[PDB]
Design a protein around this ligand. Structure first.
Ligand code: NA
Length: 280
DNA sequence: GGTACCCGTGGA
DNA sequence: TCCACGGGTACC
């Protein structure tokens, strides 16, 4: 009730590195990890980077290699985890190694994603927790898209940006998808269109994490993003419906049971997040 | 000072 | 416009 999208909140995900070359990089990440793990952390860094540089090219800096390892293979794709000082392949990696199913890899990412989460830097976690954010955003997006179709309208990427993925109230879990749809219909009837932009900032700051969230849903074969519209792929109706049905659920991983001024909890938060996100 | 997400920036 | 390098930044 009282949905007001005017309350806006930038809520990022990790910036991508693997989209352009995904069909080479995803097998590389997985095979590197499967081959060299389990192993000690020190060995992992060296051996991972030495293999990845053969894919990315000899001119690639160590910093870039490290960032691929930590940001993408580790955090965003959840491909390995640590336990008692040894690095292991994750459940998600193990499954992909058996089935080679790239859409299923991304379906699982979309199923598990939430805000808040343990991908973010601690200061950003504290911000999101301070704002009372709690949402499973991919179930939610899918339900918004179903509800749009049920009401005979179609949504643009900008609609999903402003009304959903940058809306504080939606991200707080306060708003039903039908409220979003009804508001979009009213706004359009008043010739109001909306976009997400930030003062003095380039469009990547405002939109790249929004576009890229949608990309993962497209890689899962659940939607198709064209120049104008974001549309469901009803060939995958069974998966769309299964995932959409979680739209009203609290996040499976509860960020609010951690004390982020406690040194022990800070550490448990990130470890427990990785176990939830990466493993079965 | 080191590490590792954050994000300005520009080639593709 | 997309998206990723690698410096920026702030936690580690
Ligand atoms: Na709710």
């Amino acid at each position: 009730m009282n949905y007001n999208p005017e309350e806006q909140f930038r809520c990022t995900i990790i910036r991508g590195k693997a989209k352009n070359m995904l069909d080479n990089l995803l097998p590389a990440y997985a095979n590197i990890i499967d081959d060299i793990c389990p192993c000690d952390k020190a060995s992992f860094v060296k051996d991972f980077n030495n293999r990845l540089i053969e894919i990315l090219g000899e001119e690639t800096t160590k910093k870039t290699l490290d960032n691929h390892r930590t940001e993408i293979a580790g955090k965003l794709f959840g491909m390995f985890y640590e336990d008692d000082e040894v690095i292991f392949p994750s459940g998600r990696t193990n499954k992909y190694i058996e089935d080679s199913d790239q859409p299923a890899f991304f379906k699982d990412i979309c199923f598990k994603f939430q805000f808040p989460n343990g991908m973010d830097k601690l200061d950003k976690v504290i911000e999101k927790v301070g704002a009372k954010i709690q949402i499973r955003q991919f179930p939610y997006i899918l339900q918004v898209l179903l509800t749009a179709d049920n009401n005979n309208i179609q949504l643009s990427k900008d609609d999903i940006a402003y009304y959903v993925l940058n809306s504080l109230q939606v991200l707080q879990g306060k708003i039903k998808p039908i409220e979003v749809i009804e508001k979009i219909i009213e706004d359009r009837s008043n010739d109001i269109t909306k976009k997400v932009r930030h003062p003095g900032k380039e469009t990547s700051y405002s939109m790249q994490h929004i576009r890229e969230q949608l990309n993962y849903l497209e890689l899962a074969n659940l939607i198709r993003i064209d120049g104008n519209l974001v549309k469901l792929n009803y060939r995958e109706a069974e998966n769309i419906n299964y995932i959409a049905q979680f739209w009203g659920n609290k996040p499976e991983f509860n960020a609010y049971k951690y004390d982020f001024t406690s040194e022990d909890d800070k550490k448990s938060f990130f470890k427990d997040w990785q176990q939830y996100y990466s493993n079965v």
